[PDB]
From a paper:
The eukaryotic reaction centre is a dimer surrounded by tightly bound monomeric light-harvesting complexes (LHCs) and trimeric LHCII complexes.
From the unstacked [name] dimers, approximately 20% were in the C2S configuration (two Cores, one Stable LHCII), which was previously identified by low-resolution cryo-EM. An Ab-initio model (coloured cyan) was created in RELION, followed by 3D classification and refinement, resulted in two distinct configuration – C2S (coloured brown-red) with a global resolution of 3.61 Å, and C2S2 (coloured purple) with a global resolution of 2.82 Å.
Numbering used by the authors:
A (entry chain Z): 1 to 61
B (entry chain K): 10 to 46
C (entry chain I): 1 to 35
D (entry chain M): 3 to 33
E (entry chain O): 62 to 299
F (entry chain A): 9 to 344
G (entry chain C): 13 to 461
H (entry chain W): 60 to 103
Write the structure that this text describes.
Amino acid sequence: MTSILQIALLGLVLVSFALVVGVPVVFASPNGWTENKGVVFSGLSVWFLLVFAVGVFNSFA
Amino acid sequence: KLPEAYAPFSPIVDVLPIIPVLFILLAFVWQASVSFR
Amino acid sequence: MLTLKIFVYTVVTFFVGLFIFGFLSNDPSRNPGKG
Amino acid sequence: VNILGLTATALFIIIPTSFLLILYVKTAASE
Amino acid sequence: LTYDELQGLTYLQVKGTGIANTCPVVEQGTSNVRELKPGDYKLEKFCMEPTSFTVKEVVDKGREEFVKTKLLTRLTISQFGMNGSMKINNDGSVEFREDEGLDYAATTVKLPGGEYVPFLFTIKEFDGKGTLDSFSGDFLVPSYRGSTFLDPKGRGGATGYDNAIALPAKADADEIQRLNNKSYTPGKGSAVFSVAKVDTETGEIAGVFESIQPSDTEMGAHPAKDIKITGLWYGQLT
Amino acid sequence: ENTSLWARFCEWITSTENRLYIGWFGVIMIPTLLTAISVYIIAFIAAPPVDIDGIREPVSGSLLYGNNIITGAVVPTSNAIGLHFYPIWEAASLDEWLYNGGPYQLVVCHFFLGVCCYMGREWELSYRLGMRPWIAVAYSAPVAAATAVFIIYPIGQGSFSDGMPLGISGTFNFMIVFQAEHNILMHPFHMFGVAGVFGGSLFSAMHGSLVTSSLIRETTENESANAGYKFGQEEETYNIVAAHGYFGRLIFQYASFNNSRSLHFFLAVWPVVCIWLTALGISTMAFNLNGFNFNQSVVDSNGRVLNTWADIINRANLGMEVMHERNAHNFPLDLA
Amino acid sequence: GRDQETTGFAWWAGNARLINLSGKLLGAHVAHAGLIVFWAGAMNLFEVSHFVPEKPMYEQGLILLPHIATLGYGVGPGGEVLDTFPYFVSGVLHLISSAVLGFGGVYHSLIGPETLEESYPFFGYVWKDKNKMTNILGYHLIILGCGAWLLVLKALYFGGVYDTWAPGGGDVRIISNPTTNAAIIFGYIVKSPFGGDGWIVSVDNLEDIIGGHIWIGTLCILGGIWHIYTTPWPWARRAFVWSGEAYLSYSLAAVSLMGFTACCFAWFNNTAYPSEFYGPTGPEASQAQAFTFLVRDQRLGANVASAQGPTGLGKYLMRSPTGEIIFGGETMRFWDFRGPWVEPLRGPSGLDLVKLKNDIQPWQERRAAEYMTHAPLGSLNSVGGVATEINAVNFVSPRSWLATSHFCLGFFFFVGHLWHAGRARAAAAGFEKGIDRVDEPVLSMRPLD
Amino acid sequence: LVDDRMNGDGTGLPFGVNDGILGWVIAGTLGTIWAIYFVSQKDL
Amino acid sequence: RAAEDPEFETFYTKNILLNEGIRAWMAAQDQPHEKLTLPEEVLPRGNAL
Amino acid sequence: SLTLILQLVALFAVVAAGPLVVVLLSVRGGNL
Amino acid sequence: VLGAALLCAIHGATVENTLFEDGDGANTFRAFNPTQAEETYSMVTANRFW
Amino acid sequence: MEALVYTFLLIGTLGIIFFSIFFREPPRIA
Ligand code: CLA
Ligand code: CLA
Ligand code: CLA
Ligand SMILES: CCCCCCCCCCCCCCCCCC(=O)OC[C@H](COP(=O)(O)O)OC(=O)CCCCCCCCCCCCCCCCC
Ligand SMILES: CCCCCCCCCCCCCCCCCC(=O)OC[C@H](CO)OC(=O)CCCCCCCCCCCCCCCCC
Ligand SMILES: CC1=C(/C=C/C(C)=C/C=C/C(C)=C/C=C/C=C(C)/C=C/C=C(C)/C=C/C2=C(C)CCCC2(C)C)C(C)(C)CCC1
Ligand SMILES: CC1=C(/C=C/C(C)=C/C=CC(/C)=C/C=C/C=C(C)/C=C/C=C(C)/C=C/C2=C(C)CCCC2(C)C)C(C)(C)CCC1
Ligand SMILES: CC1=C(/C=C/C(C)=C\C=CC(/C)=C/C=C/C=C(C)/C=C/C=C(C)/C=C/C2=C(C)CCCC2(C)C)C(C)(C)CCC1
Ligand SMILES: CC1=C(/C=C/C(C)=C\C=C\C(C)=C\C=C\C=C(C)\C=C\C=C(C)\C=C\C2=C(C)CCCC2(C)C)C(C)(C)CCC1
Ligand code: OEX
Ligand SMILES: [Cl-]
Ligand SMILES: [Cl-]
Ligand SMILES: [Fe+2]
């Protein structure tokens, strides 16, 4: 139950890095935010889900 | 120390203080990129 | 020596009151500029 | 040294002061 | 201000008020003084507080009298927390003994005319003898400054330069008493104590005292003046 | 319509027609200062000796008690008082008020209020003259230095006796004891301050030499060049292009100030920020942050101590430390 | 962003370009708040990753874990630490909140609306709309009062806070009967800032601390409602300047005052900053040294009331200027120090001789010795002791670090208040860019200066 | 007690006020300055 | 005056004592050519500290 | 050491993130 | 040295705070032309202020 | 005898300061 928490946390770190690199890129791109809606929303949703998953798995590990 | 589940993430924990200094230096980098207009 | 403290308190309060109410006395209207 | 220094100080505070006063009044009386 | 309401008063209500520098003054009982039970006693928390400081200075018509002064120091003149033991006989002949406690206070007074007279107000090693009305004796007076004290030019008794080193030619002859020899010989004072307002129910004694002691002798540069201390005293039996 | 007494008083106070502008900052600046000067002259002339260390060993400090001008100093407050407030009314007699160093606290408090309101008055006259207001911002650096050496260091060390004595030899004593305590020479903030005053002298000489060297010839050699400058003129008096070209081929072309506004801003900003840094260094030393400690840093392979110049500075600090306040320490650790 | 020609502000004054841009102002503010919470979380994680349990926290160079431990998280009696998981939870929560705030600030900064006035009238504002500025100030006052009441609820019903004045050496105490009396609460405010009074630094009990927090929370909530439902009066409108730079200058002066005041708390106060977490203060360490040498020479068979020093003033115990029995030596200047290990030894007349002789405690002696060893004297290389000391001890007090950094920031922000207040007055006046060259005010009045 | 003192050190005196006359002269001076300022209004 | 009257202390005399301390605690490790193996007991030192 | 290697990789990845986003925005259109 | 540092700081502050408008821009550093024969800081105003 | 010389020199210095401040040459502005 600890290894799955470590895997979820490493995935959260990777998703956070992808967000902090691409979100300013998506925003400051010339007409890029209009079409990057789905990928940015998916990244943020996966980030929130991974935060919640690490939080709920901390009680079990 | 950190909890045993979060022990391997200590090296990525140690870098986290310097991020605001990197942020103000990033503002300087961006101003260099806009040719200081 | 209480009289000295009373006198000093009166003088300090007088000068501080002139300062405060002089700056309340519409200080931005003493502007040498326009506006 | 208690009074020779007094005499030296007196001469130092007068002689160039007097000289400066000569030059200043020589200029001030001329318009 | 008795000892009852003083002990029942906390620190934060005494701080900055000067109550910590005044002796406990009894209000109950009588001034019979003879009424107290004769026998063996070992008094505790001996208290002492001056009310006037006077110096022997005048050579004129006053014929070496004691003159009023100004207290250059703050309220650092009282003495508290002293022990000892005093013996009382039936006829009234009593003896007094002071051994340890805060039995000293460095005090500097200002003579009229801008003169500084420091003195160590001590009652230590007091050997009292007499009756209840007035018992007097002698007490040991320390110097004022220790042997490791340094003057403006180094020097001093225990540690020091033993001379004036800033000039390498005049370190002898006239200034023997300043640098060649440091004097730390203790003096002796005379103290007279009067007992009044004795409360035998709680064993608390009070009254006035009269002490004459020398001032600071320093290293012997100037002869010590005589300091007369008048004030109140307080003690508790057993 | 300006007939009422308060309106007339306000117009007189805010009047720019006075010989010296008073203002609402001046209504505090003037009486507090004149109090400080009055008591400072009187104390420097005939101040009785002051027991600075609290050990009943008084220090004369005043001329009538045997001091010259270099050695004369208003002695700091008694160590028994510490950071307590000691006005005349808190003393029973003027004799003990003078014995315990009360004039030092009165001068320090009035001087701090006076310099603060002088800075405020500088802003006020800049406002009433239609000027840009940052002259007071420039003057905030000596005010910071004075506050650090008169109030902030006594606050940090817990006693007004620990402030800078109001004099010259007292100032040197403050600096020497301060070096013993904190090793101020080995501090980056003091190093920037020293670099700032040295560069301020350098830049003052640079700017003055460049402008006086490049004055336009409007007189002869038998009359002073100052007579060539007429006050209130709009024509420039020196060749900015020639001065900039001289500086550029002297030091560096692309690293020179071709704009006088930027040049004068640099002249304004360099010593001011460096004095800010050194005043903050003194204030950080007040909370015992101290300078660089390199005592026994260089060690050989066998572990023997290899002394350095910092170790010689340590020897100087020891020599000052074992001698400062030679009778006021009953214990080894100097934590006070 | 914009450029120099379109705004008149250079790159080194680029934030001035967003003076009038409400959306970019909000983006910069939210990104900055994300930065602040990021430092809080990152420093919490770094400190708990570098935390050693068998050492006190003041020896390990921590400043945030003492802040959390003062509230009573993971600590037991005597100041010892029982768990670091609350600190870890606080750090992780701050990091996640920082991520959220940083995303919001970046979004408003980059692709947020430039001006909120024409599309979001609730969040739109102009600097001269004094009613709207008072509404924003009222909302922030409600937020601040709610935070103060949240601290009050934490100290009342949510585990209490750490009391260093508890018997035995301090413990996590539940606050009961907070002192809500206006006289004693505001006597701190109208107090002198000198020795013996200390203004509000000399608050010595959590009862007064929580009572003042209740008072400030209620006052902030009522003041927020007042600002939301009122407007500035004509006297305030005449006295004040109503520019954004003016409001910034007012805030700058305020936060400079808070910085100096918090520096003074960190250096002197040992109630809101417990010594078990922050180390001894200057006065505390000096008095601990004097008291430790007192009990050492008392154990060595030497009289402590007698046996004066070389100056004849008293080597161990002597008299304060008021008259209380205080520790001898230079520590006389710290005679007003009050700590948990001297108060049981202090009677009505100061330090009682019989109490110092017989009512001694081994825990008091151990704490005094540890505080004597760990005085707030160190170099900026983190070398313990005075400047002469050998490079052998790695310790500088967190109180010293906080005091130095906060006085520095307070002084810079006072100078920033000076700069911004002057520029605000000059900008409202009209001569912030120079002299009009045709309307010089000096030539309009007579000579002789 | 050899001499008379005010003994105002410490104790947390409001504005350092030990006697009610001190607070009353504070109030009186501030009030009369405020009264002069209030009477001399509606100017400029 | 200070030599003939030991109650006369000034900041100048404090500076003189401090400079004596500098010379004494400096010479041994500052001038190796002098070979000053100065003992502890002759080095000037104040009360405790 | 493994801890030192992970610290250096994390530090390099973070310190390169700023230059990465600025270079990517400079070469990918503009608006910076 | 202290007087020279004071002179440098006070001269820079006085010049930069007694400047003429020459503006249509909030940055005064771009309000300067090297090739001109006019003063950019008011010596009269500076003299009156000091 | 030295103290009177010192006090005289300083009061002369303050006199020169007061003189230079209050009785200076007015700027001509011509
Ligand atoms: C929260 C407080 C605050 C806020 C919101 C502002 C806001 C603003 N300031 Mg200001 N200022 C402040 C405090 C503040 N200031 C302080 C404390 C000072 C010091 C006295 C200044 C001095 C100042 C000046 C001189 C100027 C401004 C200017 C401005 C405007 C443009 C800023 C800009 O883009 O420059 C860009 C920012 C930078 C170039 C960064 C500067 C580099 C710093 C100094 C590096 C220091 C970092 C270092 C590691 C910190 C350690 C030091 C110490 C703490 C140990 C802007 C609206 C300008 C203005 O007036 O516009 C109208 C301008 O001229 N400010
Ligand atoms: C506290 C630091 C701070 C903050 C929050 C801001 C914020 C802002 N500045 Mg600014 N600036 C700063 C410091 C700061 N500045 C300093 C120190 C200087 C002096 C060098 C300047 C000089 C300056 C100038 C000259 C200008 C601004 C401008 C702006 C605004 C718009 C910038 C823009 O959109 O262009 C685009 C910027 C970029 C495309 C750079 C991209 C970098 C990205 C955003 C970094 C984000 C990384 C982060 C990890 C992402 C996480 C998000 C999420 C996944 C959590 C904006 C609100 C402009 C303005 O005033 O608006 C009119 C402008 O003209 N600033
Ligand atoms: C930090 C929060 C905050 C801020 C920024 C403001 C800001 C403002 N308030 Mg306000 N207020 C607040 C909190 C705040 N208030 C709270 C918590 C309350 C509830 C008690 C009030 C109740 C209140 C009222 C009733 C009024 C204001 C008013 C005002 C406006 C003018 C005030 C003024 O002239 O300056 C400062 C004022 C002075 C310098 C004169 C007052 C004298 C002092 C400051 C009062 C305290 C005296 C006391 C002895 C000082 C001890 C502390 C000191 C030693 C440090 C101003 C914009 C006025 C207004 O315009 O209405 C909208 C108004 O009438 N406020
Ligand atoms: C050797 C013996 C002789 C020595 C001579 C020493 C002379 C010292 C005399 C004392 C100096 C006091 C000056 C007071 C002048 C007040 C008149 C005035 O200021 O103009 C009114 C003038 C009146 O308006 P106007 O005439 O229309 O311009 O403006 C004012 O009202 C401002 C008033 C300022 C009040 C502060 C007093 C001056 C403070 C600085 C003095 C510092 C004292 C130390 C002196 C040496 C340094 C200068
Ligand atoms: C130690 C003792 C002193 C403690 C004082 C503490 C209590 C007061 C502290 C907070 C007062 C809030 C000030 C806000 C108004 C200030 C500017 C103003 O004035 O605003 C100006 C405004 C103009 O319209 O007027 C107005 O809004 C009216 C506002 C002022 C109303 C208060 C006046 C009180 C009455 C006192 C006068 C006694 C007068 C005569 C004394 C003569 C003695 C011989
Ligand atoms: C009307 C008015 C005004 C004016 C004012 C003036 C004119 C000023 C001042 C002031 C002053 C003028 C102050 C003062 C003070 C002083 C003092 C406070 C003093 C002192 C002294 C002393 C304290 C001494 C001591 C001593 C010593 C030191 C030693 C020996 C002994 C003896 C005792 C001598 C104005 C315009 C502003 C406006 C408002 C109102
Ligand atoms: C929590 C706590 C507490 C409480 C506190 C409090 C409650 C506080 C407060 C307070 C307050 C309640 C304050 C007040 C204030 C105010 C201020 C600080 C102000 C200001 C400002 C100014 C400086 C002004 C100026 C001016 C003038 C005078 C003139 C005209 C113009 C103007 C207006 C600008 C205690 C300590 C108990 C305990 C611990 C903690
Ligand atoms: C706009 C702009 C800018 C920017 C600004 C800013 C300020 C930004 C930001 C931002 C931010 C403020 C961010 C933050 C963040 C955060 C994050 C991203 C996070 C996270 C998470 C995670 C993933 C974690 C994990 C963990 C845990 C849970 C615990 C253990 C440890 C670890 C680490 C594993 C600049 C200046 C450049 C330029 C100008 C304009
Ligand atoms: C991982 C982990 C965990 C978990 C955690 C969780 C799952 C949670 C969270 C979290 C969160 C989730 C946080 C947050 C953030 C958020 C924020 C930061 C917010 C915000 C908001 C705001 C700021 C608002 C604004 C506004 C608006 C927009 C409307 C109206 C107006 C106002 C202004 C109010 C724990 C620690 C257990 C353990 C360790 C690991
Ligand atoms: O008083 Mn002036 O100097 Ca400040 O450290 Mn502790 O206390 Mn005393 O010795 Mn080092
Ligand atoms: Cl010394
Ligand atoms: Cl000590
Ligand atoms: Fe120039």
